[PDB]
């Protein structure tokens, strides 16, 4: 009949997502273990926590 009817709604779909994490300054000391020079004894393998 004559009148105004509401059917559905519309939303502006979002664009490409954005991920923003803080500056990476701290790092593991992996350079001094994998690129090391001399190792410990076999029966005293180290546990570098």
């Amino acid at each position, epitope marked *: 009949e004559k009148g105004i009817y509401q059917t559905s709604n519309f939303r502006v779909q979002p664009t490409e997502s954005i991920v923003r994490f803080p500056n990476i300054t701290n790092l593991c000391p992996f350079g001094e273990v994998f690129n090391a020079t*001399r*190792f*410990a*004894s076999v029966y*005293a393998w*180290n546990r570098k926590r």
Partner: nanobody, 116 residues
Framework: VQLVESGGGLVQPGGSLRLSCAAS????????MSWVRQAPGKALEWIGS???????YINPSLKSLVTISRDNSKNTLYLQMNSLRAEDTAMYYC????????????WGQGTLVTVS
């Protein structure tokens, strides 16, 4: 000082030299003593290894050439080298716990072994 070394200077081939390696206490003697060399270009070569359990295991071609004596008053080690060669010509170190890496060890003042 917790760990130190003594003796050295110039070593006469064939003769006997009473080298020393003093310290402050026996409680710091875990787990090894060693008198080693780091020659330029040569790989790791260890000439001595005095162990915490009163053991000295050396290369079979060297332990006959080396005399062993351990003290506890000054906690010094007595070791004698004869028929010296130029392959030992380096900053001869007394490294306590040589196999424990370069953090649980002390590097001594050093000396030289030269053949005229």
């Amino acid at each position: 000082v917790q760990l130190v070394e003594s003796g050295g200077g110039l070593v006469q081939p064939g003769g006997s030299l009473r080298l020393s390696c003093a310290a402050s206490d026996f409680s710091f003697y875990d787990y090894e003593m060693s008198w080693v060399r780091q020659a330029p270009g040569k790989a790791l070569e260890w000439i001595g290894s005095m162990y915490h359990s009163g053991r000295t295991y050396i290369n079979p071609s060297l332990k006959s050439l080396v005399t062993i004596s351990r003290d506890n008053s000054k906690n010094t080690l007595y070791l004698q080298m004869n028929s010296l060669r130029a392959e030992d010509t380096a900053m001869y170190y007394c490294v306590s716990n040589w196999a424990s890496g370069s953090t649980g060890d002390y590097w001594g003042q050093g000396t030289l072994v030269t053949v005229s």
